[PDB]
Symmetry: C7
């Protein structure tokens, strides 16, 4: 096996035990609560807007004839403050599930290959949600810089009505994407639960 000190084995163990308890806690209590909590958030009015013109923020740019203070969209900011911590907390939980399943990978042995193949499939699935979640964060970072460059272009060049029209469009595009984000996150949490739950037997001992 592996060489270890009397102190070194105890400090490996405390973490291992703490992690396993964390994962078993997350799977049983946290995940079902979260699944519901965001589906309940999806009921809230800010995420179910009928007329997308109500999203539109005031622009106050002087129309030319043949600059003051331009505020950011409040509605999107309030929405962002709701979805944004949810993205981060899932990414964190993805890492937790990954650390968990990998500590359940046994000694690479020629006997009984099928069991370990299941573990690798569940693991590659969790990695695929993490990848998508990280793709969400890069969509959020894309919003502020792009809306900023949009209003900066619209104010500098007052004569072009297309620059003005895109700023409102970015807000609609962000809104729609942020709505899709919650649905995805709900589906991701749901997907993880179902894949792990149904296969847990084999996941804990592939042998």
């Amino acid at each position: 096996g592996v060489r270890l000190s009397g102190e070194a084995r105890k400090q490996v163990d405390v973490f291992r035990q703490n992690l396993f308890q964390e994962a078993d806690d997350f799977l049983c209590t946290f995940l079902p609560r979260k699944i519901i909590s965001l589906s309940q958030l999806l009921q809230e009015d800010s995420l179910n807007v009928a007329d997308l013109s109500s999203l539109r923020a005031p622009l106050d740019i002087p129309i030319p004839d043949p600059c003051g203070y331009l505020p950011g969209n409040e509605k999107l900011l309030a929405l962002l403050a709701l979805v944004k911590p949810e993205v981060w907390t899932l990414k964190e939980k993805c890492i937790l599930v990954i650390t968990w399943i990998q500590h359940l990978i046994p000694k690479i042995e020629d006997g009984n290959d099928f069991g370990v193949a299941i573990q690798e499939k569940v693991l590659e699935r969790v990695n695929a949600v993490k990848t998508k979640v990280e793709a969400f964060q890069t969509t959020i970072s894309k919003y502020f810089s792009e809306r900023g460059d949009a209003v900066a272009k619209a104010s500098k060049d007052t004569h072009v009505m297309d620059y003005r029209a895109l700023v409102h469009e970015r807000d609609e595009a962000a809104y729609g994407a942020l709505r899709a984000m919650v649905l995805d996150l709900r589906a991701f949490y749901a997907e993880l639960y179902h894949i792990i739950s149904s296969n847990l037997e084999k996941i804990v001992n592939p042998k």
Copy 2:
């Protein structure tokens, strides 16, 4: 753990509702949209918007966006989003129908993964549509901004009208694709549903 059940049951009802009522209605509704005149323009020169940029002479006002395209965009744009949403719904549905990974009877699960990868390919194309729409406003904006700043170059003017034609053609292709996508999903799921619900039997 009965708090997980309400969602599961609610989702299954949602998916079965979408497949039976929503999808056929949508399929028709956009094919009916394709009949409307705004999407079947004979002369593409009628699309062209006024430009009002002063021509220089050898020794600016306000430039409006294309109304016709804006009105068209307001029709296709919510259709793109609603499909992307339904793609997620179908995905969540099929994945909850994936059984315990078991050595017995591999063939059934292989069918589920094929239908799933197909829906993902539709979502990928739909997300490619949204990035085409986002590309329109910034590109037409930079086009008129360049055309107004440099009045002497007439190809800058000619491209603004070209972007509108390029957008129109793309937006027309979008509806056809969306119709085909909804149709494709229905047919793939319907014909295989038997195996999709229980790959094991």
Copy 3:
């Protein structure tokens, strides 16, 4: 599962699509094939001297110690001929795709070979669509690039290379647009031949 409204709504479209595809294959495709090959005969697409393509460039030459700059009319007139042909094919590619996919049967273990034929024809049509979309991005590339070319040539009057490239873009576009028609003809022809020769298996991969 089916409902009273759903039964009708799916069938009408299905029947309408099949009729559309069978109509396209029999009448439209042969007519197109000829119509563009007849276009290829026209003089605007068979220019001997490419210097005749060259458009006037109104730029003052500097001396050692600007007005209107119009686009190339000849290319514009050519573009108005090829451009709708690119779009109409892309549309027909989608039609053929929707058609073949509605002919894909239940995924079944019995008789795998037939379905393999369907997927090959389908991947071929997708490869044609990919090339057609590559044509549209070549057309979009022309106006922005010729624009930046004349804008650079006017701003910097001293460089003769900028002036030389504007005329070169027009020649490069012309040659590409000529290649486009040839390709489009070949694509329509290729589709007809692949579908026609295999239609038997395409409609029923299983038999009976």
Copy 4:
């Protein structure tokens, strides 16, 4: 569904016309071309001993602690020789492609080996077309890059490296354009040999 008397006859006229075109190209055109460029390779403009003779005058005032700058004539004259050769091959690549694809038979389980030969020759011709299109993007790269080079060299007079590179681009272009002719000769030659030696199997993969 069988086609009308005018419909299939119009599919036939093109088919027959294409086959005649391809058989004409293979027998007469290709050998003539192969020689014609190899004869071009003999010409002095393409075999320059001293590459400093390529160098064009720059006339930019040296600073102490602008007029109009002409393009390189020698390269322009060379370009006018290689450039139509690139386009004409790209066109012929499309012709060979349309030809071989009309020779692809019904996808059938019997005798797979023959069709595999057809696909190999076809993928080879596609690889030649890809390289030819890579040549056109090298030519387009020349004018914009030499233009930006002289524009930078004139704006910032104090830096010699800008001036040095303009002459370097011309040498880099020359060398590339020389390699282009060799490649085109080799491509035409390669096509002839691959098609000629395998023609038997190319026309009928099934045999008989």
Copy 5:
């Protein structure tokens, strides 16, 4: 003579790796999980992260604009941890590769295990190098953000994003520690459970 100089390094490396695996790794695993307990890394209200901006609001030249202190203090904690792991990844790599035997036709399975563990460690190094490029991205991006916000005072979205970058950095830096803990943990478990086969893929004794 040449073998004597290769030997000292070889022996020194093996001792280093065996030292790292037994003493260093478990201590590190704990030390950062203990860091994760600290308050600077568990902030409830992310608005407390927000740094003062002092840019004059226009009405219908510029003062000194400092960087965020809270992020700087956090960076000084995560940043040396990223580098030290990258270093240890190289150490494990050098170790396992010196344990690769003569390529021989007999008993292929054992060497296949070694290559799998090795490709895993390389994947960890790749992710760690992706972390360094995220840190380098922070300063240049926050800099361009405040530079844009000061130059164009009128546009709020520039000012709002500077605070957003700090939140985005914070969240990423938090994820970094979690990942690093998981990486160290993952390496220990993969090596420990397979060590037998890792030292001798062939199976020998003397």
Copy 6:
């Protein structure tokens, strides 16, 4: 094969090419292999102190509380470039020659005796990999002048930054090192081609036998 004396005229090219390739392989290649390895002995390519490479910069240093003269190129690098640059082009040309040669030796695609043709394709893909690397060298050379130019242009415009000045000298060192590696590679490439073709020539000329 319907008409024309021009079939005796695809023969002239074929024969001319084969003679060219056989000439290149026997006489040219060994001479080249040596000639560059002899170049590698020359002092300009074996510089001890890389500070001797450094070219004068003459940019006025600012003073804390005035436009530049003429800024020459690095002569040492220019002289080196004039030696490596024609060698890169001549190899790229010879790669095309070897390619045209081996492809004319590919026989009728036939089911009988597959192994022989597999050898031909391996040698061919190898020569293509050499050409790819040689074309990567030309794009490194083109990168030098534009990058050194933008470097001095930035250094002169902004006099106050010493790192802009420092990188110009660094590009010259980076170019030198790369150009040295280039000749080593070219020697190795010529050597590699000779060995791969020579040892396998038997199978390369007739993959079938007979």
Copy 7:
């Protein structure tokens, strides 16, 4: 077989023999000396800095209230002059090992495939080392242009402290990377020795021709 001119066969042989001697010389004498020499460099204080704040170079940019010549970080420059020639010399030796192993590839023959497979594995490994070492050169080139653009931005916009902090950060980022470089280079030389040494038997004759 291959046809040869008397002069050409002499000219092919002299190089062949010279290369083999070079490679055998490199493997036996150079490589062990290098392995040690850098690991001895790793002991030196400039590469083992406790406080990374000591790396920080003076910036002299006037703080605004609501010019000058800015020198390059000497410490990094002195470090660069140490690692930089080591990167180049390894890249050169990678080419040498490659030329060597490829001249040991025999006639492609159907008999005894296993031996040649070993040669290709060692070769692809050396190529992977060369790739990483070319990735190091592009990291070094990245340093000067990036630090330059950093101080140029920091001087132009005096009011933004983030630009000023990043310049010091690049130096720390470079230092850490340059430290990792030496470790990697040591590991690369070591890795090459071990892979070649343990397999040399098969590397010289994959066919198992009697010694």
